[PDB]
Design a protein around this ligand. Structure first.
Ligand SMILES: O=c1ccn([C@H]2C[C@H](O)[C@@H](COP(=O)(O)NP(=O)(O)OP(=O)(O)O)O2)c(=O)[nH]1
Ligand SMILES: O=c1ccn([C@H]2C[C@H](O)[C@@H](COP(=O)(O)NP(=O)(O)OP(=O)(O)O)O2)c(=O)[nH]1
Ligand SMILES: O=c1ccn([C@H]2C[C@H](O)[C@@H](COP(=O)(O)NP(=O)(O)OP(=O)(O)O)O2)c(=O)[nH]1
Ligand SMILES: [Mg+2]
Ligand SMILES: [Mg+2]
Ligand SMILES: [Mg+2]
Lengths: 127, 128, 126
């Protein structure tokens, strides 16, 4: 059940649960960026991680940013074996640019359990 | 563990319904009329609170008909097991038509997603 | 755990992982379609599937199409008992039309584990 986190620069922040019982770990921007109104952006984190066996890491939205700033996460599927820098894709569905500073929390990581070793069987009909 | 506890906060709430014993999610119903403006967003009241099973969180996920026919996308959507407030549905309207919601309309579904909720974070110099 | 796939036409492609340890099975368009700028569309796949017991099929976005083309999946909850054709609903949040050709990978299927046998208990307080 280990979540291994690698901080790639001094600007990274270890992901943190917002509360003791939160489903997700908040993910912090490591560099300023603005997500334009009715536009999108890719936020740097300067982190890598290896999620637990049996999961993938889902980059999910924070509800406050959704309501107040019209922000939704895009993409969001991080494989357990990914060792590159994790990036957060954000869409801004509002009419106001959304300014992000280093150290702002921009999403939350959820360790989603999945079946990642299914046997695929082709059949004539599911019926 | 295999119990979903549901608190109704108003007479106009609806207990979420699966219907088919093998559907993924429980339908979530608006408890108050609301209009989601075109190219805009809104927060739908449900007048329910719930506690999902241990080892899950509640994901507010889209109904399929609304996405195609109305340009509606479900936003936010992560409900913690220990949340006791009113559950609200965040909807974005990416179409050019306002989307009218009436009390009793199905607006989303709740999926009890299994997660690792007790991981230990280990900070390492390299994942290699 | 078995993922059963029904191919409804010769234009369908059996879903494939992008690599041996990918989380998701890439889903292929079976017919050309254009997703309009700032609008949405529905991609045919000409497949049906029955996911493993204990899961549902989530139609999740690919990161490249998100960044490059402004594409987000919509809807995307495939119940284990759904036997119809699975279509991929795409939102295009960009101001550019997105053209899809038969055989393009347009989304990824994730076999998400869930509690699908909970019992509802109505209580006066949590
Ligand atoms: O779609 C949602 C999302 C969340 N909520 C509620 C339940 C959830 O547990 C709580 C917090 O969600 P987030 O962690 O996504 N919001 P945020 O990080 O902005 O605020 P918080 O400080 O509460 O964590 O808000 C909803 O009612 N509907
Ligand atoms: O939001 C994301 C999504 C993915 N990623 C990284 C990790 C993930 O494992 C990797 C691949 O994700 P996808 O399969 O969604 N992208 P795509 O299918 O476009 O590229 P690939 O050929 O690498 O599979 O990109 C992020 O950093 N942020
Ligand atoms: O992206 C999707 C979403 C759903 N579907 C299929 C599978 C799913 O199990 C079935 C029903 O989806 P919803 O609960 O999302 N749609 P809704 O509640 O509007 O209508 P229905 O009465 O058909 O369930 O539609 C797709 O093919 N693609
Ligand atoms: Mg939070
Ligand atoms: Mg439904
Ligand atoms: Mg991929």
């Amino acid at each position: 059940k280990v979540l291994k986190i690698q901080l790639r620069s001094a600007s990274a922040t270890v992901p943190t649960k917002g509360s003791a019982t939160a489903a997700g770990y908040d993910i912090y921007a490591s560099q300023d960026i603005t997500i334009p109104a009715m536009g999108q952006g890719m936020v740097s984190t300067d982190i890598s991680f290896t999620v637990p066996v049996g999961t993938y890491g889902r980059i999910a939205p924070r509800s406050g940013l959704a309501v107040k700033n019209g922000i939704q996460t895009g993409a969001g599927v991080v494989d357990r074996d990914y060792t590159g820098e994790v990036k957060v894709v954000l869409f801004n569905h509002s009419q106001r640019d959304f300014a992000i500073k280093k150290g702002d929390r921009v999403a939350q990581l959820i360790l989603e359990k999945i079946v990642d070793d299914a046997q695929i069987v082709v059949v004539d009909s599911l019926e």
